[PDB]
Design an enzyme around this catalytic site. Structure first.
Site, PDB file in Angstrom:
ATOM      1  N   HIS A 115       0.811  -1.214   0.000  1.00 32.05           N
ATOM      2  CA  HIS A 115       0.000   0.000   0.000  1.00 32.05           C
ATOM      3  C   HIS A 115       0.847   1.268   0.000  1.00 32.05           C
ATOM      4  O   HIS A 115       0.360   2.345  -0.345  1.00 32.05           O
ATOM      5  CB  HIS A 115      -0.946   0.013   1.203  1.00 32.05           C
ATOM      6  CG  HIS A 115      -2.039  -1.004   1.122  1.00 32.05           C
ATOM      7  ND1 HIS A 115      -3.061  -0.927   0.201  1.00 32.05           N
ATOM      8  CD2 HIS A 115      -2.277  -2.119   1.854  1.00 32.05           C
ATOM      9  CE1 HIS A 115      -3.878  -1.952   0.364  1.00 32.05           C
ATOM     10  NE2 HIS A 115      -3.423  -2.691   1.361  1.00 32.05           N
ATOM     11  N   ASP A 150      -4.098 -10.365  -1.648  1.00 37.09           N
ATOM     12  CA  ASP A 150      -4.498  -9.713  -0.407  1.00 37.09           C
ATOM     13  C   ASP A 150      -5.980  -9.355  -0.473  1.00 37.09           C
ATOM     14  O   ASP A 150      -6.547  -9.249  -1.557  1.00 37.09           O
ATOM     15  CB  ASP A 150      -3.650  -8.461  -0.168  1.00 37.09           C
ATOM     16  CG  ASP A 150      -3.823  -7.885   1.222  1.00 37.09           C
ATOM     17  OD1 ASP A 150      -2.884  -8.008   2.039  1.00 37.09           O
ATOM     18  OD2 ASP A 150      -4.892  -7.303   1.497  1.00 37.09           O
ATOM     19  N   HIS A 152      -7.137  -6.524   0.304  1.00 36.02           N
ATOM     20  CA  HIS A 152      -7.180  -5.142  -0.156  1.00 36.02           C
ATOM     21  C   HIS A 152      -6.467  -4.960  -1.489  1.00 36.02           C
ATOM     22  O   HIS A 152      -5.554  -5.710  -1.828  1.00 36.02           O
ATOM     23  CB  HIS A 152      -6.565  -4.213   0.892  1.00 36.02           C
ATOM     24  CG  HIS A 152      -7.192  -4.332   2.246  1.00 36.02           C
ATOM     25  ND1 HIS A 152      -6.863  -5.333   3.134  1.00 36.02           N
ATOM     26  CD2 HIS A 152      -8.134  -3.578   2.862  1.00 36.02           C
ATOM     27  CE1 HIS A 152      -7.571  -5.189   4.240  1.00 36.02           C
ATOM     28  NE2 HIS A 152      -8.351  -4.132   4.100  1.00 36.02           N
ATOM     29  N   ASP A 239      -5.397 -11.980   5.119  1.00 29.93           N
ATOM     30  CA  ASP A 239      -6.576 -11.319   5.667  1.00 29.93           C
ATOM     31  C   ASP A 239      -7.811 -11.626   4.816  1.00 29.93           C
ATOM     32  O   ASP A 239      -8.857 -10.997   4.965  1.00 29.93           O
ATOM     33  CB  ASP A 239      -6.348  -9.810   5.785  1.00 29.93           C
ATOM     34  CG  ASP A 239      -5.829  -9.190   4.506  1.00 29.93           C
ATOM     35  OD1 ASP A 239      -5.491  -9.938   3.566  1.00 29.93           O
ATOM     36  OD2 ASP A 239      -5.744  -7.947   4.448  1.00 29.93           O
ATOM     37  N   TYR A 278      -4.366 -10.497  10.033  1.00 32.49           N
ATOM     38  CA  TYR A 278      -4.378  -9.896  11.359  1.00 32.49           C
ATOM     39  C   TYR A 278      -4.981 -10.816  12.416  1.00 32.49           C
ATOM     40  O   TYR A 278      -5.042 -10.470  13.595  1.00 32.49           O
ATOM     41  CB  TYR A 278      -5.104  -8.554  11.291  1.00 32.49           C
ATOM     42  CG  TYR A 278      -4.464  -7.669  10.248  1.00 32.49           C
ATOM     43  CD1 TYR A 278      -4.997  -7.563   8.969  1.00 32.49           C
ATOM     44  CD2 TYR A 278      -3.286  -6.990  10.524  1.00 32.49           C
ATOM     45  CE1 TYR A 278      -4.391  -6.772   8.006  1.00 32.49           C
ATOM     46  CE2 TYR A 278      -2.674  -6.202   9.574  1.00 32.49           C
ATOM     47  CZ  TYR A 278      -3.227  -6.096   8.317  1.00 32.49           C
ATOM     48  OH  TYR A 278      -2.608  -5.309   7.373  1.00 32.49           O
TER      49      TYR A 278
HETATM   50  C1  LIG Z   1      -9.025   0.406  13.066  1.00 33.09           C
HETATM   51  C2  LIG Z   1      -8.950   0.162  11.562  1.00 33.09           C
HETATM   52  C3  LIG Z   1      -9.728   1.227  10.796  1.00 33.09           C
HETATM   53  C4  LIG Z   1      -7.505   0.077  11.076  1.00 33.09           C
HETATM   54  N1  LIG Z   1      -6.964   1.420  11.255  1.00 33.09           N
HETATM   55  C5  LIG Z   1      -6.023   1.668  12.170  1.00 33.09           C
HETATM   56  O1  LIG Z   1      -5.569   0.805  12.905  1.00 33.09           O
HETATM   57  C6  LIG Z   1      -5.532   3.088  12.286  1.00 33.09           C
HETATM   58  C7  LIG Z   1      -4.034   3.076  12.557  1.00 33.09           C
HETATM   59  C8  LIG Z   1      -6.290   3.761  13.434  1.00 33.09           C
HETATM   60  S1  LIG Z   1      -7.493   4.733  12.596  1.00 33.09           S
HETATM   61  C9  LIG Z   1      -6.899   4.486  11.069  1.00 33.09           C
HETATM   62  N2  LIG Z   1      -5.830   3.820  11.055  1.00 33.09           N
HETATM   63  C10 LIG Z   1      -7.565   4.979   9.821  1.00 33.09           C
HETATM   64  C11 LIG Z   1      -8.561   5.943   9.876  1.00 33.09           C
HETATM   65  C12 LIG Z   1      -9.160   6.367   8.694  1.00 33.09           C
HETATM   66  N3  LIG Z   1      -8.784   5.851   7.516  1.00 33.09           N
HETATM   67  C13 LIG Z   1      -7.817   4.908   7.439  1.00 33.09           C
HETATM   68  C14 LIG Z   1      -7.192   4.452   8.592  1.00 33.09           C
HETATM   69  C15 LIG Z   1      -7.419   4.348   6.093  1.00 33.09           C
HETATM   70  N4  LIG Z   1      -6.648   3.122   6.253  1.00 33.09           N
HETATM   71  C16 LIG Z   1      -7.118   1.890   6.436  1.00 33.09           C
HETATM   72  O2  LIG Z   1      -8.310   1.634   6.481  1.00 33.09           O
HETATM   73  C17 LIG Z   1      -6.088   0.794   6.567  1.00 33.09           C
HETATM   74  C18 LIG Z   1      -6.624  -0.354   7.417  1.00 33.09           C
HETATM   75  C19 LIG Z   1      -5.718  -1.552   7.260  1.00 33.09           C
HETATM   76  C20 LIG Z   1      -5.443  -2.046   6.057  1.00 33.09           C
HETATM   77  C21 LIG Z   1      -4.532  -3.246   5.943  1.00 33.09           C
HETATM   78  C22 LIG Z   1      -4.199  -3.524   4.482  1.00 33.09           C
HETATM   79  S2  LIG Z   1      -3.083  -4.947   4.377  1.00 33.09           S
HETATM   80  N5  LIG Z   1      -6.629   0.111   8.798  1.00 33.09           N
HETATM   81  C23 LIG Z   1      -7.513  -0.404   9.649  1.00 33.09           C
HETATM   82  O3  LIG Z   1      -8.313  -1.258   9.303  1.00 33.09           O
HETATM   83  K   LIG Z   2      -5.370  -7.875  -3.577  1.00 35.67           K
HETATM   84 ZN   LIG Z   3      -4.827  -6.398   3.355  1.00 35.01          ZN
END
Ligand SMILES: CC(C)[C@@H]1NC(=O)[C@]2(C)CSC(=N2)c2ccnc(c2)CNC(=O)C[C@@H](/C=C/CCS)NC1=O
Ligand SMILES: [K+]
Ligand SMILES: [Zn+2]
Ligand SMILES: [K+]
Length: 349
Positions: A115, A150, A152, A239, A278
């Site tokens: 990413h 993945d 995502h 995941d 995760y």
């Molecule tokens: C809790 C949950 C939303 C978690 N997030 C987080 O732990 C933190 C560090 C805390 S709040 C936040 N990040 C966030 C807020 C708003 N927008 C995003 C992240 C965009 N990013 C993702 O959604 C990645 C996404 C993980 C993607 C793994 C791709 S292998 N993370 C998350 O699922």
């Molecule tokens: K993928």
């Molecule tokens: Zn992922």
């Protein structure tokens, strides 16, 4: 003989991520407990240099990554630069082994962070080791296929090569209004000279092994025929596996395994990477299983006694059972996507 990127120092470094505490150790220990490491060539990972990381990432981002390791404009902990360099160097080392002809398969389960942008950290990724591995493989190979399984969308790797025909990126991922990272619709086919050299397969929640492989094999078949790659980079984020807190796909390591088999029978230089995943015990289950697949060995159902045995409750078996969630993937939509991709690949020549 498959190369296995490993060192006690490398595992300890990777374990220091808060989002996946001690996953690298759980992954390694389970593999070790099945004695799969004896059937591989253990290679110590080198730490990536500044110029190696600069092959993709901007100097300003790298300098700033090094500063916070001691701005939200770069998507940014402590010791995070050393973490990034270790993983980035591990994937390069594995790629270098592919160049040296030391093996036909190089494994780096702690890599696969796809990413990260050239100047932005994103989705728990601080450095795109996938791109750095591809850029190293570009020293010898002219055509490189990147396959991203993945949950995502591998947006970082796609954007990296969006304008080139030297590298084609195939990504199967969950695509939904609001779901990270929001990109990767089937219409997304790259831009400019690299048009139609980016393949995206939007999939809905609940998909299981059978339907998944039917999509994956169908896509990879016509990709192999049209693109005809000289090297493969495989990202296998766990995941997608049932039990993951993401709770989207309903996959088991057996379904991912069949996708892996179909790729390995191409008998090309293959770079195997981890990524997401995760549910730590389940992630360890998957990649250990997949390693057995790479070695062509069948693993015992019972989890061997090792350091993290208590984490495999309440069943303590290697196999993972699909959740009792419905499948949101309708047959017509899938075929409509498959036919669309099939049309895009015809432009590749
Ligand atoms: C809790 C949950 C939303 C978690 N997030 C987080 O732990 C933190 C560090 C805390 S709040 C936040 N990040 C966030 C807020 C708003 N927008 C995003 C992240 C965009 N990013 C993702 O959604 C990645 C996404 C993980 C993607 C793994 C791709 S292998 N993370 C998350 O699922
Ligand atoms: K993928
Ligand atoms: Zn992922
Ligand atoms: K491309």
């Amino acid at each position: 003989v498959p190369v296995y990127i490993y060192s006690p120092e490398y595992v300890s470094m990777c374990d220091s991520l808060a989002k996946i505490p001690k996953r690298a150790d759980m992954v390694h220990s389970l593999i070790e407990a099945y004695a799969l490491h004896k059937q591989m060539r253990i290679v110590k990972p080198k730490v990536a240099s500044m110029e190696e990381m600069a092959t993709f990432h901007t100097d300003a981002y790298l300098q700033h990554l090094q500063k916070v390791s001691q701005s939200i404009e770069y998507g940014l902990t402590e010791g995070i630069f050393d973490y990034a360099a270790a993983i980035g160097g591990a994937t390069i080392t594995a790629a270098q082994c592919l160049i040296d002809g030391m093996c036909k398969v190089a494994i780096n389960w702690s890599g696969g962070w796809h990413h990260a942008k050239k100047d932005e950290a994103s989705g728990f990724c601080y450095l795109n080791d996938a791109v750095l591995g591809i850029l190293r493989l570009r020293r010898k190979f002219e055509r490189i296929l990147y396959v991203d399984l993945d949950l995502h969308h591998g947006d970082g790797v796609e954007d990296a090569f969006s304008f080139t025909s030297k590298v084609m990126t195939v990504s199967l991922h969950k695509f939904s209004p609001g779901f990270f990272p929001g990109t990767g619709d089937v219409s997304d086919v790259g831009l400019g000279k690299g048009r139609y050299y980016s393949v995206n397969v939007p999939i809905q929640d609940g998909i299981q092994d059978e339907k998944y492989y039917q999509i994956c094999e169908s896509v990879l078949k016509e990709v192999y025929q049209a693109f005809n790659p000289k090297a493969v980079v495989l990202q296998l984020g766990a995941d997608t596996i049932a039990g993951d807190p993401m709770c989207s796909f309903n996959m088991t390591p057996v379904g991912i395994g069949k996708c892996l088999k179909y790729i390995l029978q191409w008998q090309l230089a293959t770079l195997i990477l981890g990524g997401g995943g995760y549910n730590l015990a389940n992630t360890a289950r998957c990649w250990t299983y997949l390693t057995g697949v790479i070695l062509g060995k069948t693993l015992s159902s019972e989890i061997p006694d090792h350091e993290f045995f208590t984490a495999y409750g309440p069943d303590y078996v290697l196999e993972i059972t699909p959740s009792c969630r419905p499948d949101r993937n309708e047959p017509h939509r899938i075929q409509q996507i498959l036919n669309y991709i099939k049309g895009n690949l015809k432009h590749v020549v």
